[PDB]
């Protein structure tokens, strides 16, 4: 599924991601935009052989299992394919764990380079929330 902007905002809010760990809803929508362009089925191979999955491009190196990243961890206890579903529950639940691990949203390189320090509220402007 490819989400619309306000559609994704509403889903993220309903699942309690808004203001989670101090990060306003706009930060999360901006991250999803530059990581996946809002596409739940997005995948990308990393130079080390791991793969990023889903709307928030969660890395099989640490967070999910895909059976082809030898030596990796599965900290959200999920098959990486669960992160590709039309329902974003698994991606949100896993994202709540990543952002809580000490580095905040700096875990998402696209967020740091393209969202951090910008007017992130712009990503939820206009939406009925
Ligand atoms: Br915001
Ligand atoms: Br782009
Ligand atoms: Br794969
Ligand atoms: Br693996
Ligand atoms: Br393969
Ligand atoms: Br959903
Ligand atoms: Br933080
Ligand atoms: Na893994």
Swiss-Prot record:
Cellular compartments per GO CC: cytoplasm; endoplasmic reticulum; extracellular space
EC number(s) stated in the UniProt entry for this protein: 3.2.1.17
InterPro entries according to UniProt: Glyco_hydro_22, Glyco_hydro_22_CS, Glyco_hydro_22_lys, Lysozyme-like_dom_sf
Domain C-type lysozyme: 1-129
Any one GO molecular-function label of the UniProt entry: lysozyme activity
UniProt-annotated binding residues for substrate: 101
UniProt xrefs under SMART domains: LYZ1
Alphabetized Pfam families for the sequence: Lys (PF00062)
Oligomeric and partner information: Monomer.
Additional information: Lysozyme C is capable of both hydrolysis and transglycosylation; it also shows a slight esterase activity. It acts rapidly on both peptide-substituted and unsubstituted peptidoglycan, and slowly on chitin oligosaccharides.
Similarity-based family: Belongs to the glycosyl hydrolase 22 family.
Role according to the record: Lysozymes have primarily a bacteriolytic function; those in tissues and body fluids are associated with the monocyte-macrophage system and enhance the activity of immunoagents. Has bacteriolytic activity against M.luteus.
UniProt-recorded name of the protein: Lysozyme C
């Amino acid at each position: 599924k490819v989400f619309g902007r306000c559609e994704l905002a509403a889903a993220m809010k309903r699942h309690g991601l808004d203001n989670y760990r101090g990060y306003s809803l706009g930060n999360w929508v901006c991250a999803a935009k530059f990581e996946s362009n809002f596409n739940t089925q997005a995948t990308n191979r990393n130079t080390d052989g791991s793969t990023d999955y889903g709307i928030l491009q969660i890395n099989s190196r640490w967070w999910c299992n895909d059976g082809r990243t030898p030596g990796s961890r599965n900290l959200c206890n999920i098959p990486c394919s669960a992160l590709l579903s039309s329902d974003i529950t698994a991606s949100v639940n896993c994202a709540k764990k990543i952002v809580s691990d000490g580095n905040g949203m700096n875990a998402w390189v696209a967020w740091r380079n393209r969202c951090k320090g910008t007017d992130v509220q712009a990503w939820i402007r206009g939406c009925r929330l």
